[PDB]
């Protein structure tokens, strides 16, 4: 496996070994082939095999009780058995070192890309004050940030970083005793790398390829604008387990941002990159016949999934990799160039100085998600660099050319596809869409354990309102949305998020009228909407065409759906009766069928 | 609406009102329309909205990840929201009093039926010693941690608390017998205690097998799932009309004050001490019941204290036998109606003729009982002719309204016994390679795979999980070996779980389950014992030495009952099963395994 640096990872391990000295042992039967194994201690639990169901949403979506994708959505094995299954399958892998020429194209590209990214902005340290305002305004952690003992523990670790040491920065793929430490490890990386998000280095204005701060309602408009650029097909290749395909070489090139930092900042970022990103101590659960053990494992490469900076760094490396693939397709890169150690910077720099930015404007990149419209279709077959870099495509043989899209409306990006709709008044809307079962299925999952009737009904309302705003074009979703909003007390404010997505702007987290909010988003504040004439009725808010709706998972046409649509008032009354005597509205009167 | 007999129910409520004085209140916004409302108190919420998944079984049944009836099984809402949903839907209903002529046919039938049932047996008290030996040995009474009950029977304080309540019963009073709703040692000791007092008076019904086919003619108590199909086939041999297996909508809720009074008639056969305790159970806990039910409020969770005169208590000892008795009675009454013995006229008149009914009972009764297979609310009836299909006057008036069928629509009869639904199964007649016939239990495959995939709440130990998977796997080898997908999945699970690991935790709470699969004995040896050696309907005792001579349903029938055979996804799973087995083994560890896939060598 990894030959570990005990002078970087040792202290972190020694602290774990000492916290659990009673049960600490070295299990010779450890499964780890590609990760370094340090030892185990005794647990349990830590997870659940079945995710909680929202009674409100399930009661108002009966035809979906027999839809397999809907029911699949709630099946997640968080048990040690489950954790070990995914680990052995997806995480315990080694990526072969890219060829010396590949490593050289990557470094030239990364140098140029960071220079380009920092042309107007400058890296900076993020502060305690900045972190505090974020925890407060993003819903146990809120108290920790107000306890001066948390900030004393944070300074303790920062002082170790200044000495090139690491005491508590351990990650885990799974009281104040260990939850104050978790937040402390997150602040220290926020302090050094948080500027990437806070200062919007990945915004479309700054990065050309980025979409940071755009929002789901805007991504489709962006894809449509890219579709306007002369060139080949639109390629949206998915990488199999991207985070695991992040090499020691990608980490070395990502680090180059430090070259733009002031001496005080550069020291803390160097500590994060060196001690936590390029050397990691992980704690993964393992079921034993007896009970549950916690294993202590370490790696040099791969990305840490929960980390601050995972989005921007994945976005940066992907932009770099897609630039390298465009060079290959254009003929600038060859098999000889990737195999050559003494690769010449000249033709690559020439292509970056002259073509670079233009080529970036042909892409929509968000973490591991990319949409690329090359100058021609040779890119489909430009796989030498991609595969050698470790960015192997998911569900496709290694040397099979990529599938390109000729219709932008069909391109997969950020778990959606985007439809162009014509409103009754002739104005066009570009709407986010995804398989309906994925939306209903997710809506049916109550977040956390034993949540009160209030939180349950409010989270249902959050989902219903997200649908009125983003997925109003889906027949089943507008009906279910009206049903939920009629069944939940009007004055009840939506609580808990419907998604952790970067692209979610949570416009539905309100008690404001949904048509008023719809107008703000789609008409008033929409940059691609010239005519600001308001929509006064949901009658003038469009739907997908019947057959597009059916292709995207709609149940319209089904006897079971027609039955549900008709008998929805009874289901609403049932939910009202279960909630109690509260102030409710009827939202069904909007062309009731 | 409810008019509560406060002299009976009062003390029980007063006791609750005391123990929870801090939060006790009368909530004016209570939903109860048919139950009497006494008051509420705030409690810390109980139950789960999602059932735990078996990682072992799910890993070895991948094609079923996309089968809807499979994932359906995992959906159970036990939260206050869920409890209130079911309650408002079925439990909060009133059954109109049967007509005076119906009430009279019912009483004559019930008198005759109990005297027939007690012709050879005599009611008796069940002992503390018997109750302990049953809890210790996890036997069967009313059917996730029974280890709490294991301890309770050893403390003489539990038995002192029992005694206190028994003395109240002897005086016609009730202090602690309250029923808890579904779907702390102090309150646990009370629960078990209420269960024992019920067992002491009425447990003789199960323990002495009053509902065995020998004693009751219609009963199937102690027969077992492997025997029910043979029984249906034997009933199919009796000259008469079609086979009727009508399902009653929420039977327990349709048990009237009149059914409870007729059920009580068993007391007429009891010695004065026994009769005293049974009278206390019937009149104070069955004919007047105090219930604890949860209710979600915007603020939090409240526990509600409600009361009723009629309806059956679902978790009670004696629910099986009493439901079996009333159903036998009701199906006898429906047979009388179809035969012309009962009329719309007869069901109406208060001063009814016992003569015509007794004549039919003394002459026809027992014969008519031998035409039925009754198990609680489940009935299979083969009448003398098909007039029974339209004989709905008494059935509907008694409150035994049929599920998912318009009130006056004639019933659907089966001409093929193999298609008759009974005890969640149907039964296929299979011909073995050697020409011998087997009568096998069968049900939709999705229901079996779905249930297998449910890790029984508590028990998250990889050992407990894999061992419960093995219990399911072995139940399939014995009862559902005839299902292609199930024999393959069974061999896969048994190959994936260490050989010496004993199956633990039950696969079912069914009365008909005999748990022959709860062993490390060879499954083919156990299969032989059950299907050949000890099968009364198997004349030729020639042993089966290979699973290759153990039959399957015909490809067609297997597909009708939910088999995935023919599907590319199934062919893929069948082929790649060794990888899935290795995965579970890797996850389990370095243990002693055995490959059972070559039982098919390997198909
Ligand atoms: Zn650290
Ligand atoms: Zn769509
Ligand atoms: Zn009592
Ligand atoms: Zn069948």
UniProtKB/Swiss-Prot annotation, chain A:
Residues the record lists as binding Zn(2+) 1: 157, 161, 166, 169
Annotated residues for binding of Zn(2+) 2: 417, 433, 552
Cytoplasmic-facing ranges: 1-593
Topology of this chain in the membrane: Peripheral membrane protein
Location in or out of the cell: Host endoplasmic reticulum membrane; Host nucleus
The organism's place on the tree of life at top rank: Viruses
Reactions catalysed according to its record: a 5'-end (5'-triphosphoguanosine)-ribonucleoside in mRNA + S-adenosyl-L-methionine = a 5'-end (N(7)-methyl 5'-triphosphoguanosine)-ribonucleoside in mRNA + S-adenosyl-L-homocysteine; a 5'-end (N(7)-methyl 5'-triphosphoguanosine)-ribonucleoside in mRNA + S-adenosyl-L-methionine = a 5'-end (N(7)-methyl 5'-triphosphoguanosine)-(2'-O-methyl-ribonucleoside) in mRNA + S-adenosyl-L-homocysteine + H(+)
Domain RdRp catalytic: 233-383
PTM description: Sumoylation of RNA-directed RNA polymerase NS5 increases NS5 protein stability allowing proper viral RNA replication.
Subunit record text: Homodimer. Interacts with host STAT2; this interaction inhibits the phosphorylation of the latter, and, when all viral proteins are present (polyprotein), targets STAT2 for degradation. Interacts with serine protease NS3.
Purpose of the protein: Replicates the viral (+) and (-) RNA genome, and performs the capping of genomes in the cytoplasm. Besides its role in RNA genome replication, also prevents the establishment of cellular antiviral state by blocking the interferon-alpha/beta (IFN-alpha/beta) signaling pathway. Inhibits host TYK2 and STAT2 phosphorylation, thereby preventing activation of JAK-STAT signaling pathway.
Protein name, as recorded: RNA-directed RNA polymerase NS5
Protein's organism: Dengue virus type 3 (strain Sri Lanka/1266/2000) (DENV-3)
Higher taxonomy: Viruses, Riboviria, Orthornavirae, Kitrinoviricota, Flasuviricetes
Residues of the full protein shown: 2758 to 3378 of 3390
From Swiss-Prot, chain B:
Domain of life (superkingdom): Viruses
Residues annotated as binding Zn(2+) 1: 165, 169, 174, 177
Post-translational modification: Sumoylation of RNA-directed RNA polymerase NS5 increases NS5 protein stability allowing proper viral RNA replication. Phosphorylated on serines residues. This phosphorylation may trigger NS5 nuclear localization.
Cytoplasmic side: 1-603
Chain positions recorded as Zn(2+) 2 binding sites: 426, 442, 561
Domain RdRp catalytic: 242-392
Membrane topology type: Peripheral membrane protein
Catalysed conversion reaction: a 5'-end (5'-triphosphoguanosine)-ribonucleoside in mRNA + S-adenosyl-L-methionine = a 5'-end (N(7)-methyl 5'-triphosphoguanosine)-ribonucleoside in mRNA + S-adenosyl-L-homocysteine; a 5'-end (N(7)-methyl 5'-triphosphoguanosine)-ribonucleoside in mRNA + S-adenosyl-L-methionine = a 5'-end (N(7)-methyl 5'-triphosphoguanosine)-(2'-O-methyl-ribonucleoside) in mRNA + S-adenosyl-L-homocysteine + H(+)
Subcellular localization(s) per the UniProt record: Host endoplasmic reticulum membrane; Host nucleus
Protein function: Replicates the viral (+) and (-) RNA genome, and performs the capping of genomes in the cytoplasm. Besides its role in RNA genome replication, also prevents the establishment of cellular antiviral state by blocking the interferon-alpha/beta (IFN-alpha/beta) signaling pathway. Inhibits host TYK2 and STAT2 phosphorylation, thereby preventing activation of JAK-STAT signaling pathway.
The protein's assembly and partners: Homodimer. Interacts with host STAT2; this interaction inhibits the phosphorylation of the latter, and, when all viral proteins are present (polyprotein), targets STAT2 for degradation. Interacts with serine protease NS3.
Protein known as: RNA-directed RNA polymerase NS5
Provenance organism: Dengue virus type 3 (strain Sri Lanka/1266/2000)
Residues of the full protein shown: 2758 to 3379 of 3390
């Amino acid at each position: 496996p990894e030959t570990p640096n005990m002078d970087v990872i040792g202290e972190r391990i020694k602290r774990i070994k000492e916290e659990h000295n009673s049960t600490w042992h070295y299990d010779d039967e450890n499964p780890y082939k590609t990760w370094a194994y340090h030892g185990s201690y005794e647990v349990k639990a830590t997870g659940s095999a079945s995710s909680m169901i929202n009674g409100v949403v399930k009661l108002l979506t009966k035809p979906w009780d027999v839809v397999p994708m809907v029911t699949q959505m709630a099946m997640t094995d968080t048990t040690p058995f489950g954790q070990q299954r995914v680990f052995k399958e997806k995480v315990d892998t080694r990526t072969p070192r890219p060829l010396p020429g590949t490593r050289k194209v990557m470094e030239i590209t990364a140098e140029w890309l960071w220079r380009t990214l920092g042309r107007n902005k400058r890296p900076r340290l993020c502060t305690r004050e900045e972190f505090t305002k974020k925890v407060r305004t993003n819903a146990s952690a809120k108290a920790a940030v107000e306890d001066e003992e948390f900030w004393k523990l944070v300074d303790r670790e920062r002082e170790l970083h200044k000495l090139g040491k690491c005491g508590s920065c351990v990650y885990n793929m799974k009281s104040r005793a260990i939850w104050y430490m978790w937040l402390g490890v997150r602040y220290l990386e926020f302090e050094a790398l948080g500027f990437l998000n806070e200062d919007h280095w990945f915004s479309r204005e700054n990065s050309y390829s980025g979409v940071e701060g755009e929002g789901l309602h805007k991504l489709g408009y962006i894809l449509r604008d890219i579709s306007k650029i002369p060139g080949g097909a639109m390629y949206a290749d998915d990488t199999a387990g991207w985070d695991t395909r992040i090499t020691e070489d990608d980490l070395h090139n990502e680090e180059k941002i430090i070259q733009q930092m002031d001496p005080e900042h550069r020291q803390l970022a160097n500590a994060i990159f060196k001690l936590t990103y390029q050397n990691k101590v992980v704690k993964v659960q393992r079921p034993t016949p007896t009970g549950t053990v916690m294993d202590i494992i370490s790696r040099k490469d791969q990305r840490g999934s929960g980390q601050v900076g995972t989005y921007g760094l994945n976005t940066f490396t992907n932009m770099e990799a897609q630039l390298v693939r465009q060079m290959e397709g254009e003929g600038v890169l060859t098999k000889a160039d990737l195999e050559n150690p003494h690769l010449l910077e000249k033709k690559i720099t020439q292509w970056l100085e002259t073509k670079g930015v233009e080529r970036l404007k042909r892409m929509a990149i968000s973490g591991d998600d990319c949409v690329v419209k090359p100058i021609d279709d040779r890119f489909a077959n430009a796989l030498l660099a991609l595969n050698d870099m470790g960015k192997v495509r998911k569900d496709i043989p290694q040397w099979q050319p990529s599938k390109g899209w000729h219709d932008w409306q069909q391109v997969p990006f950020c778990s959606h596809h985007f439809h162009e709709l014509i409103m009754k008044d002739g104005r066009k809307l570009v709407v986010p869409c995804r398989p309906q079962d994925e939306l209903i299925g997710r809506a049916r999952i109550s977040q956390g354990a034993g949540w009160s009737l209030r939180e349950t009904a409010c989270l249902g309302k959050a989902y219903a309102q997200m649908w009125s705003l983003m997925y109003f074009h889906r027949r089943d979703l507008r009906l279910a949305s009206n049903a939920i909003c009629s069944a939940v007390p009007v004055h009840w404010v939506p609580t808990s998020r419907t998604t952790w997505s970067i692209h979610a702007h949570h416009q539905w987290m309100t008690t404001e009228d949904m048509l008023t909010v719809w107008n703000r988003v789609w008409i008033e504040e929409n940059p691609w909407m010239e005519d600001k004439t308001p929509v006064t009725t949901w009658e003038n808010v469009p739907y997908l065409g019947k057959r597009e709706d059916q292709w995207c998972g709609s149940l319209i046409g089904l006897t079971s759906r027609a039955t549900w649509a008709q008998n929805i008032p009874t289901a609403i009354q049932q939910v009202r009766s279960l909630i109690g005597n509260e102030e409710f509205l009827d939202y069904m009167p909007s062309m009731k069928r």
